[PDB]
Amino acid sequence: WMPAYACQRPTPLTHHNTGLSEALEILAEAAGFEGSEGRLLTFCRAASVLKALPSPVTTLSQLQGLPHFGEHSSRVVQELLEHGVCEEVERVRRSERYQTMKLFTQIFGVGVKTADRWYREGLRTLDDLREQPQKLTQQQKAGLQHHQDLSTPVLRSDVDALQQVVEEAVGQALPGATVTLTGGFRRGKLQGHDVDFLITHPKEGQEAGLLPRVMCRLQDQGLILYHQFERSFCIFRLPQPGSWKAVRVDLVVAPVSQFPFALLGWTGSKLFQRELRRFSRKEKGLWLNSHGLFDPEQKTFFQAASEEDIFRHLGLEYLPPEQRNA
DNA sequence: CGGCCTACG
DNA sequence: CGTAG
DNA sequence: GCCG
Ligand SMILES: [Mn+2]
Ligand SMILES: [Mn+2]
Ligand SMILES: [Mn+2]
Ligand code: NA
């Protein structure tokens, strides 16, 4: 009754197994810090299954037959049901390795591989990094300078103000171009780490060269604290009562022919899209990315005019963005 | 056992 | 290497 | 870590 792929089931933003899913996601995150993408995926998938259930898991028997629940994930749930805590999870939580890798990878410009190298060098704190700026890229310097603001959640009220300033710049750069909110806010989140926008133009080809023109205009308005094509990963100045704060903003351009694929990809969730691409390739023999959907036997691309088209071409029931919170 | 999403900057 | 969902 |  529970399909194996996250793109085969609705997953709402809020659900009935929050504590259980959180614990499994700690173990997933820890596996990622150790470079075990397979273990990360299984724990992420198990967590996602619980988010899709219609009511709370109260007894171990309710895990029977659920996909991605084997001995390990089942034992985590068992311990949480019986004692309210899982010793493995708590050991990860308090571990110096987990805490430091989490802190370092949160920095814009720092990935698992950099964080791990710094950890092995003995570094543990942000001030450790600041007192050695020669070891840092300009991207990492920006991420470290702005880390405090970037650690503060973006609110949906922030988002609407940002969208209007992006629209004004986009309108000067190319009249008729449009701006669509994507990412977690499109899935209904009330908060986020960043804001994602997708830009296109109704006349195919008119979007060529657009993003540099948009960025130059935002920079001239004094709004860009950091940036640097079709993707721009920025830090923006956002107004605040009597001051401002730094906010991560991603700007993406797509031709209108590819817009449904780009919208689908950039709306996420991350696990939803990995699962959708995995389903496409393994179950349907089609190759999906944010530009299109390729049939490698006919050597043809599927034209899509909507996200609904894409779900139909993959043989999946349509899920609105609010149900893609895998 | 092999596989685990698939891009761009 | 970083970034994205 | 789990599916197939
Ligand atoms: Mn986002
Ligand atoms: Mn983003
Ligand atoms: Mn993301
Ligand atoms: Na990072």
Q: Which residues surround ligand 1, an ion (CB under 5 A)?
A: A 183-184, 194, 196
Q: Which nucleotide is nearest to A114 (CA to C1')?
A: C1
Which of A7, A49, A4, A2 shows the shortest CA–CA distance to A288? A7
- Asked if A235 contacts A247 with a C-beta cutoff of 8 angstroms, the reply is yes
Say if residue A113 is exposed, middle or buried (CB neighbours under 10 Å; 0-12, 13-18, 19+): exposed
Tokens of A85: 């805590």
Instruction: Round to whole Å and give the CA distance between A205 and A257.
Output: 9
Q: Where are the domains of chain A?
A: 1-95, 96-152, 153-256, 257-325
What ranges make up the beta strands (E) of chain A?
A: 154-155, 178-181, 191-192, 194-200, 224-226, 231-240, 243-253, 287-288, 293-295, 300-301
A128 is catalytic: no
Q: Is A116 annotated as a binding residue?
A: no
Resolution at which this structure was determined, Å: 1.6
Which method was it determined by?
A: X-ray
Provide the 10 A C-beta neighbour count for residue A29.
17
Pick the catalytic residue from A116, A149, A158, A194. A194
Which of A25, A31, A70 shows the shortest CA–CA distance to A51? A25
Ligand with smallest separation from the Cα of A142 = 4
Sheet of strand A231-240: strand arrangement: A178-181, A194-200, A243-253, A231-240, A224-226
Between the alpha carbon of residue A160 and those of residues A153, A157, A165, A239, A312, the distances in Å are: 15, 6, 9, 12, 32
A160 is catalytic: no
User: What's the A189 CA to ligand 2 centre distance in angstroms?
Assistant: 13
A116 is catalytic: no
Instruction: Round to whole Å and give the CA distance between A270 and A183.
Output: 9
Which of A204, A325, A178 shows the shortest CA–CA distance to A256? A204
